[PDB]
Amino acid sequence: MTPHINAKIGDFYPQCLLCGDPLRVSYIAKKFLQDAKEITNVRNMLGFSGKYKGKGISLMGHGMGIASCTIYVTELIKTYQVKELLRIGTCGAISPKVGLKDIIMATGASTDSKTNRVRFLNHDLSATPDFELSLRAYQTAKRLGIDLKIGNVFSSDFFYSFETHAFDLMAQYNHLAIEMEAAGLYATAMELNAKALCLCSVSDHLITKEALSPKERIESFDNMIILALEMMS
Amino acid sequence: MTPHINAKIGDFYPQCLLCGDPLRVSYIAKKFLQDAKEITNVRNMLGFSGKYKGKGISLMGHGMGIASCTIYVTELIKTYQVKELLRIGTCGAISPKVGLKDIIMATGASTDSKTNRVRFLNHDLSATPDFELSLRAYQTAKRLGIDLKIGNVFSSDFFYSFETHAFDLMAQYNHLAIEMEAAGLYATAMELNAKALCLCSVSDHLITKEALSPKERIESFDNMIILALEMMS
Amino acid sequence: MTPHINAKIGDFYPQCLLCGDPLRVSYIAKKFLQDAKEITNVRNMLGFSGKYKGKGISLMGHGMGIASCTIYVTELIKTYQVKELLRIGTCGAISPKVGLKDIIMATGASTDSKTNRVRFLNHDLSATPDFELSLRAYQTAKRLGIDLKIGNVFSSDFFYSFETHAFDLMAQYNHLAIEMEAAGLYATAMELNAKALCLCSVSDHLITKEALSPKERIESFDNMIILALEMMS
Amino acid sequence: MTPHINAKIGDFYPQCLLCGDPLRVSYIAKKFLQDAKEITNVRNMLGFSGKYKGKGISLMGHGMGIASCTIYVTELIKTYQVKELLRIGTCGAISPKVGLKDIIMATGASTDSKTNRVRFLNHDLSATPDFELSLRAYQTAKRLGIDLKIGNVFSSDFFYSFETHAFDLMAQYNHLAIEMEAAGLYATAMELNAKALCLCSVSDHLITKEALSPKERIESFDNMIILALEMMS
Amino acid sequence: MTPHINAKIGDFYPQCLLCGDPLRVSYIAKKFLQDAKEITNVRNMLGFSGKYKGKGISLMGHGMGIASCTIYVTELIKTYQVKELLRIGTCGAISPKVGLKDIIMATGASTDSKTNRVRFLNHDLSATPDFELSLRAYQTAKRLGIDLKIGNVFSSDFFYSFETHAFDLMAQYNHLAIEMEAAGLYATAMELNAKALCLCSVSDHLITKEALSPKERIESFDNMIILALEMMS
Amino acid sequence: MTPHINAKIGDFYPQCLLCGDPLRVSYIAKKFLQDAKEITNVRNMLGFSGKYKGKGISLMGHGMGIASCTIYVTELIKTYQVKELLRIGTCGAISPKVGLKDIIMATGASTDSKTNRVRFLNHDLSATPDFELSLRAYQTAKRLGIDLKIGNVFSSDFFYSFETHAFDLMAQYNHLAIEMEAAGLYATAMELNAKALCLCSVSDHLITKEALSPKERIESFDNMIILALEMMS
Ligand code: HPA
């Protein structure tokens, strides 16, 4: 009933977990939820509803990049009444103060996109998450015994960067890692008065080149999954 | 080998078709290819290698928006030696010179993205297709009896535009339609010394708000797929 | 030991409270601090060192605007070894979600300045405070029974705005009020790896035109001075 | 009848050739046209109407730089009803793919000018020729056994560049040569719904530093002159 | 020899008058100079040397627009050792403070070009004339009983503007008239350590549309010619 | 009468000297004026009225940075009917040609601020003083035998520059020094139709690293002060 979601109205709980990869959403729905039901699949972009420790929770893939993430979040909020958008994914660390398996909470999302200057008077929009959600994330991680890393991320239009020489200046200004959506998620949620947070686990270090093995990857993504479901409980 | 395609090095023919929607890809594999093999499925983004009248050809989804398109197109060219990239898809008409069913050949792709300024000295990159390819498309459509409409497209980061007041100016400067990736397709192929072209089928006119019925939407999309397969013959 | 500060090295405590107006700094010192000494007075810009419940506190004025603020923040951090910088002041509200007497915590500072494009690759810097400082403010407010309003502010180069028509768009994107230094404070503290936060008291509401009287302005600000002081004990 | 052109209305044929230098224009008329007459001479910028193998063709000089080109082209289309504009001139080649005596067809014109941002919403306008004209140039060229070199051109505001370090990157993005008008020609033609094409003779590299001798300039340019007159016949 | 001037080295005197129209340069040579000879004529862009009441002086055309002006004045300074460049021409008035026949001395030249951002770190270059020259023009005007209007001009890349709605804001900021080269003359003279000045005669009013009779233009331009020659005396 | 000035009606004379430092302002009052009265002191920013050689003159502090100077200058013109604003401040030299406590007259003020693009259509505002005021400076300085350098200054948002590599380019374009308010003064005075001029004494040399002290920045500048007083006589 939107050009990118074929769910029925009401099929989404007001809390939604987000990933770029629709197959990760699938993995989460099978392994971590009871009574999960696939509710959308336009363009193979999967969404699910189901229960986690008795509470209703929703999952939704959103593709890669600001433009794509912006499409699905816009529809999720405007048509399907999602109110809290918690978003999890991987990132390449650029700071010396984070390493493999760390979970980063993005209190800001810088960007090389033009999307926010187009949204916001051609000025600098400081794209930021909802504070109460970050507080629930901080509190839950302490309780779970996770050493939550906290700082800005840089949301890039480029997976294959042309500005790799600038990563140290980004790290100087407290950017812990690079991904590709958070500035879009945060700006859209600000645009539509909804609540958003982004969480990112370190799977590679772009400076010193250490990398997780493909099943070390899955163990640390699981650690992040559990943190996310726990803070929505 | 790449973080977004799980094909083996050697599975792609040098010619490749592209669509945002990977479900479009499999529909073309089934209904039009012989010996259609699936060769990649990372993040549900399906790819296919098959046969059309005895000649090899590939298919590949690339998701929505410039950032996603660039990732897949960069990896196709750099890792899988793809040489000719032909993008087909839908687009929103903005010009009185076009209506529903029309197929548009994009001789240039303007954009509201900052990606080309980042790539290109913060100047104006004129994002354009390979000429030889555009000639094939013109001759094939003449041989096939298709009244090819030719002009610019505007590639936007926004599906839900904040600048609809501007569509009239775009149309005046010979922009026939809007979509969300061609400027990225063209600049990547320009960057990596490969050949590229973008074809667009008109499904919705954004000015008159005419829309095709899905009985014609499959009808017109087939016309375009055939034109594209023909010019790769 | 800098062109703009004539204190002795060591005169500053590592926690420093900031106001634009040096006479506000003079007030706080005389009314709320023990054994307050004046440590700097270049350009009539007063800084102080004293105690509050036995614990050392410093105070410093920074003038109006990002450029003036940046000058003093840089010198405090670099020459005088200050580690936490807490800014408190007034602000014009622009959001319906806040009214007179409200204290705002700025979890992000947007801007019409070019300073952060100059510092940060001509990209978008998301200027954010230190998280631990923000959590300390949330907990101290809760303990004092203060109803903290959390969101962005907008830091302008213009007190006399040429863009008043834009305040509705800023409010929509969760900018709760307008002032003139937070973006430079946050970016300088980001640049030099120090901890910073901004707190804003609503005395005027730029949209609904409500306003506190001179005696209610004094009363309201005092409520913010005590939260700040309580935050540092 | 316009401030920059002296001709009576109807003096111009609907197909017009353009050079930057009005002495090229006078040269073309006396060696290749029959019954040729000077129709305009404001600011010494010569224009001619004449006959080539029976068919009436016009010639018009336009000066150097986008702003100059834009003045003349604007008056040709709006006042004197020229419909097709074929620009022929020299350029400095920057790509290894082209060498001396080569004729470049500019299928896109990049630029360091701000004019197209001012024309086009401060976005990227991809400035492009009319496809049909470019195909006629390709078909004519091959009929005359001229191997056309095809790609993008960079239209600069600077003859004495301050960014010579950037030429390698421009060449990477398929810019074959540098000149100073094409992006202004294409944009204006797009604005005013006219058909336009730029052709460029490789007199001088800029990288190799190879410059052909006095004898050859005349010969290579005449070659482009015949190409131009033939696709207009 | 330079690409755009075929004068002998040593042909120019160190003081040069400039006009965009080479036929204006010819007119001044024949009417006001003693023993004037033509020294250059590339691209029909005439230059002259001669004497004014016994003292040597040169005249040079430079076409229209910043790019064209910049080519010629660069070559005048670096190759032909011209030291003082005084540009005379017409403009369109935009301010109610000036009328027809008024002579404007441009103490600053704003622009919509990108050329000064390209020259100067993408900041704002304040393009200004040489102070001593503007003093000499002030004094000579007084001597001649000419009432000199003094202010900024706006140097536009557009003769046919797309921002006529902005003319009033320009006039508010002390822009007396619009023309097309002064920002380039000024920035090039600044780049190359020469002395430049621009004087403008009001032929037309862009707001109230008043105009001089082409009989009253010839007379008013003459006054400006005499001012320029005399201040070189 | 404004939120930043609390002077009585008519407390300001129509001529007003400006400093960034209100203590340099106070030092001029107490040393040079008869009947010196302090007419404002909001935020410790001192303004004074008094008499010099019989004629009544005012003095006003404006803080550091374009934003602060705009606030005070805007209020001086709109509420206190100041007509002539003469800034006499400090600046850092960026040439060996220029020594400490040299006095510069800024015929133009370039900037890295975005304030003038915000004010002026996102084009290049050429920020210049009132000519007659600068002629007064020139003739006054000469009658007094006070030496005066004349050129542009660069008005930065940054006292601690992040672009020290650019100083030679700035000096190349006739920028004699760096300061932080002249572009703000000049723009505001252009906006509101008032007469402004900026003089500045070299208080630092940015190549060789000499710097005066806070007290020397009040007391080493008598010649500039006397120059200002005399030109207002
Ligand atoms: O170095 C400087 N930069 C800016 N303003 C100044 N005022 C004195 N020195 C300086």
Cβ-contact B22, A43 below 8 angstroms: yes
Residue type, E102: D
User: What is d(CA F165, CA F188) in angstroms, rounded to the nearest whole number?
Assistant: 30
Using DSSP, state whether F170 is helix, strand or coil.
helix
User: What is d(CA F49, CA F58) in angstroms, rounded to the nearest whole number?
Assistant: 4
Domain ranges of chain D: 1-233
* Top mutation candidate among F204, F207, F213 for ligand 1, by most atoms within 8 Å of CB: F204
* Top mutation candidate among F19, F64, F66, F91 for ligand 1, by most atoms within 8 Å of CB: F91
Cβ-contact B75, B4 below 8 angstroms: yes
User: What is d(CA C150, CA A107) in angstroms, rounded to the nearest whole number?
Assistant: 13
| Cα–Cα nearest to C158, from E163, F129, F117 | F117
User: What is d(CA C158, CA B155) in angstroms, rounded to the nearest whole number?
Assistant: 34
| Cα–Cα nearest to B177, from B86, B104, B89 | B104
Q: Whose CA is nearest to atom 7 of ligand 1?
A: F91
Q: Residue F64: its chain C contacts at CB < 8 A?
A: 4, 43, 63, 65, 67-68, 71
User: What is d(CA E7, CA A80) in angstroms, rounded to the nearest whole number?
Assistant: 75
Using DSSP, state whether F104 is helix, strand or coil.
strand
- Would you call F180 and C67 a contact, using CB atoms and an 8 Å cutoff? yes
- Whether D44 and chain E come into contact, CB under 8 Å, resolves to yes
**Which residues partner with A155 through β-bridges?**
A111, A179
The token duo for E180 is 């097309």
* Cα distance from N-terminal residue to C-terminal residue, chain A: 29
User: What is d(CA E67, CA E35) in angstroms, rounded to the nearest whole number?
Assistant: 32
Q: What angle do CA A183, A188, A194 make, to 5 degrees?
A: 120
Whose tokens are 């960007």? That residue is: A111
Q: Whose CA is nearest to atom 2 of ligand 1?
A: F92
Q: Structure resolution in Å?
A: 2.3
DSSP letters for E97-122 = T--TT-EEEEEEEEES-SHHHHHTTT
Identify the active-site residue in B21, B130, B204, B222: B204
Cβ-contact A19, A62 below 8 angstroms: yes
Phi-psi region of A94 (alpha: psi -120 to 50; beta: other; left: phi over 0): alpha
Using DSSP, state whether E163 is helix, strand or coil.
coil
Centroid of ligand 1 to alpha carbon of F222 (angstroms): 19
Rg (chain A; Cα; Å): 17
H or E element in which residue E152 lies: strand E148-155
Tell how strand D84-93 and strand D195-205 pair up.
Answer: parallel
Cβ within 8 Å of residue B217, ≥6 positions away: B203
| Cα–Cα nearest to F227, from F167, F142, F166, F151 | F142
User: What is d(CA D184, CA D191) in angstroms, rounded to the nearest whole number?
Assistant: 10
Contacts 24+ apart (CB under 8 A), D215-222: D216/D100, D216/D101, D219/D101, D220/D100, D220/D101, D221/D24, D221/D90, D222/D31
| Cα–Cα nearest to B15, from B76, B67, B74 | B76
H or E element in which residue C186 lies: helix C182-191
- Would you call F118 and C157 a contact, using CB atoms and an 8 Å cutoff? yes
Cβ-contact C72, C61 below 8 angstroms: yes
Identify the DSSP state of E7.
Answer: P
Tell how strand B175-179 and strand B84-93 pair up.
Answer: antiparallel
Whether F128 lines ligand 1, by a CB cut-off of 6 Å, is no
Cβ-contact D4, D40 below 8 angstroms: no
For D67, which of E3, E61, E67 is closest by C-beta distance? E67
User: What is d(CA A107, CA A129) in angstroms, rounded to the nearest whole number?
Assistant: 6
H or E element in which residue C148 lies: none
For residue A231, which phi and psi values (nearest 5 degrees)? -75, -10
Chains that touch E (3 or more CB pairs under 8 A): D, F
H or E element in which residue C35 lies: strand C34-40
Using DSSP, state whether E88 is helix, strand or coil.
strand
* Coarse DSSP helix, strand, coil percentages of chain C, rounded to the nearest 5 percent: 35, 30, 35
DSSP letters for C81-97 = ---EEEEEEEEEE-STT
Torsion from C-alpha of C197, C202, C207, C211, nearest 10 degrees:
-160
E204 classed as catalytic: yes
Centroid of ligand 1 to alpha carbon of C147 (angstroms): 43
Ligand 1 atom nearest to F203, measured from its CA: 8
Q: Residue F66: its chain C contacts at CB < 8 A?
A: 65, 67, 157
| Cα–Cα nearest to C199, from C142, C151, C160 | C151
Centroid of ligand 1 to alpha carbon of E121 (angstroms): 19
Identify the active-site residue in F124, F130, F204, F222: F204
| Strand residue runs (E) in F62-194 | 84-93, 103-111, 149-155, 175-179
**What CATH class does A1-233 carry?**
alpha beta
Whole-angstrom CA distances from D208 to D93, D176, E207 are: 9, 13, 52
DSSP letters for E21-69 = -HHHHHHHHHHH-EEEEEEE-GGG--EEEEEETTEEEEEEE--SSHHHH
- Would you call F108 and E128 a contact, using CB atoms and an 8 Å cutoff? yes
**How many Cα atoms occupy the beta-carbon half-sphere of E229 within 13 Å?**
22
- Give just the sign of the alpha carbon dihedral D140, D143, D145, D151: positive
Our CA-based measurement puts residue E159 at a distance from the nearest CA of chain F, in whole angstroms, of: 16
- Give just the sign of the alpha carbon dihedral A98, A102, A107, A110: positive
User: What is d(CA D129, CA D151) in angstroms, rounded to the nearest whole number?
Assistant: 11
- Whether A113 and chain C come into contact, CB under 8 Å, resolves to yes
Cα C137 versus chain centre, distance: 13
Torsion from C-alpha of B174, B178, B181, B182, nearest 10 degrees:
-20
Cβ-contact B74, B32 below 8 angstroms: no
- Would you call B180 and A20 a contact, using CB atoms and an 8 Å cutoff? no
User: What is d(CA C108, CA A25) in angstroms, rounded to the nearest whole number?
Assistant: 30
DSSP letters for F5-61 = B-PPTT-S-SEEEEES-HHHHHHHHHHH-EEEEEEE-GGG--EEEEEETTEEEEEEE
Cβ-contact E20, E69 below 8 angstroms: yes
Q: Residue A162: its chain B contacts at CB < 8 A?
A: 118-119
The token duo for F54 is 């019989």
Ligand 1 atom nearest to F156, measured from its CA: 4
| Cα–Cα nearest to E171, from E205, E196, E198, E200 | E205
For B123, which of D110, D126, D190 is closest by C-beta distance? D110
For residue D223, which phi and psi values (nearest 5 degrees)? -50, -50
Q: Residue B64: its chain A contacts at CB < 8 A?
A: 43, 63, 65, 67-68, 71
| Strand residue runs (E) in chain A | 15-19, 34-40, 47-52, 55-61, 84-93, 103-111, 149-155, 175-179, 195-205
- Give just the sign of the alpha carbon dihedral C30, C36, C41, C45: negative
Torsion from C-alpha of F116, F121, F125, F130, nearest 10 degrees:
-90
b/e sequence C140-169, b meaning 16+ C-beta within 10 Å: bbeeeebebbbbbbbbbbbbebeeeebbee
For residue A18, which phi and psi values (nearest 5 degrees)? -120, 140
User: What is d(CA E21, CA E63) in angstroms, rounded to the nearest whole number?
Assistant: 6
Whole-angstrom CA distances from F55 to D77, F35, F50, F141, F230 are: 64, 11, 8, 19, 10
H or E element in which residue E161 lies: none
| Cα–Cα nearest to A111, from A165, A198, A180 | A180
User: What is d(CA E93, CA E151) in angstroms, rounded to the nearest whole number?
Assistant: 12
Cβ-contact F22, C46 below 8 angstroms: no
Centroid of ligand 1 to alpha carbon of F206 (angstroms): 9
DSSP letters for chain B = --SS----TT-S-SEEEEES-HHHHHHHHHHH-EEEEEEE-GGG--EEEEEETTEEEEEEE--SSHHHHHHHHHHHHHHH---EEEEEEEEEE--TT--TT-EEEEEEEEES-SHHHHHTTTSB------HHHHHHHHHHHHHTT---EEEEEEE-S-SS-S-GGGHHHHHHTTEEEEESSHHHHHHHHHHTT-EEEEEEEEEEETTT--B--HHHHHHHHHHHHHHHHHHH-
User: What is d(CA D24, CA E8) in angstroms, rounded to the nearest whole number?
Assistant: 23
Cβ within 8 Å of residue B118, ≥6 positions away: A112, A157, A158, A162, A163
Whole-angstrom CA distances from C30 to C63, C177, C221, F101 are: 20, 29, 15, 39
Cβ-contact D110, B125 below 8 angstroms: yes
| Cα–Cα nearest to A109, from A178, A157, A61, A62 | A178
* Cα distance from N-terminal residue to C-terminal residue, chain B: 29
Q: Residue D112: its chain E contacts at CB < 8 A?
A: 114, 118
- Would you call F124 and E138 a contact, using CB atoms and an 8 Å cutoff? no
User: What is d(CA C83, CA C194) in angstroms, rounded to the nearest whole number?
Assistant: 5
What method was applied to determine this entry? Answer: X-ray
Mutate one of E25, E26, E41, E45 to test the D interface: name it (highest D CB count within 10 A): E45
- Would you call E68 and D68 a contact, using CB atoms and an 8 Å cutoff? yes
Residue type, D154: F
Residue type, E142: K
Cβ within 8 Å of residue D84, ≥6 positions away: D14, D15, D16, D130, D133, D194, D195, D196, D232
| Cα–Cα nearest to D111, from D123, D93, D126, D97 | D126
- Would you call C68 and F71 a contact, using CB atoms and an 8 Å cutoff? no
SS (H, E, C) chain D: CECCECCCCCCCCCEEEEECCHHHHHHHHHHHCEEEEEEECHHHCCEEEEEECCEEEEEEECCCCHHHHHHHHHHHHHCCCCCEEEEEEEEEECCCCCCCCCEEEEEEEEECCCHHHHHCCCCECCECCCHHHHHHHHHHHHHCCCCCEEEEEEECCCCCCCCHHHHHHHHHCCEEEEECCHHHHHHHHHHCCCEEEEEEEEEEECCCCCECCHHHHHHHHHHHHHHHHHHCC
Cβ within 8 Å of residue C48, ≥6 positions away: C25, C26, C28, C29, C33, C36, C37, C38, C39, C58, C59, C60
- Would you call D157 and E114 a contact, using CB atoms and an 8 Å cutoff? yes
- Whether C65 and chain F come into contact, CB under 8 Å, resolves to yes
Whether F92 lines ligand 1, by a CB cut-off of 6 Å, is yes
User: What is d(CA F161, CA F156) in angstroms, rounded to the nearest whole number?
Assistant: 8
Whose tokens are 């990132």? That residue is: A91
Chains that touch D (3 or more CB pairs under 8 A): B, E
| Cα–Cα nearest to D42, from D79, D1, D83, D78 | D1
Longest dimension (CA), chain F: 48
b/e sequence C86-122, b meaning 16+ C-beta within 10 Å: bbbbbbbbbbeebebbbbbbbbbbbbbbbbbbbbbbe
The token duo for D160 is 């004495």
Q: Residue A115: its chain B contacts at CB < 8 A?
A: 157-158
- Give just the sign of the alpha carbon dihedral F25, F26, F30, F36: positive
- Whether E111 and chain D come into contact, CB under 8 Å, resolves to no
- Whether D185 and chain B come into contact, CB under 8 Å, resolves to no
Cβ-contact E28, E101 below 8 angstroms: no
User: What is d(CA F13, CA A171) in angstroms, rounded to the nearest whole number?
Assistant: 52
Whose tokens are 């407010």? That residue is: C141
- Give just the sign of the alpha carbon dihedral D176, D182, D187, D192: negative
Smallest CA–CA distance from B170 into chain D, residue: D120
Phi-psi region of C116 (alpha: psi -120 to 50; beta: other; left: phi over 0): alpha
Cβ-contact F61, F108 below 8 angstroms: no
Q: Residue C4: its chain F contacts at CB < 8 A?
A: 64, 214
Length of chain F as a residue count: 233
Q: What angle do CA F165, F167, F172 make, to 5 degrees?
A: 125
Q: Whose CA is nearest to atom 5 of ligand 1?
A: F179
User: What is d(CA A192, CA A190) in angstroms, rounded to the nearest whole number?
Assistant: 6
Instruction: Report the interhelical angle of C131-143 vs C214-231 (nearest 10°).
Output: 120
Whole-angstrom CA distances from F80 to F23, F25, F72, F75, F170 are: 21, 18, 11, 7, 36
Tell how strand A175-179 and strand A15-19 pair up.
Answer: unpaired
Whether F178 lines ligand 1, by a CB cut-off of 6 Å, is yes
Using DSSP, state whether A180 is helix, strand or coil.
coil
Contacts 24+ apart (CB under 8 A), F145-149: F146/F103, F146/F223, F146/F226, F146/F227, F147/F102, F147/F103, F148/F103, F148/F104, F148/F105, F148/F227, F149/F98, F149/F102, F149/F103, F149/F104, F149/F105, F149/F176
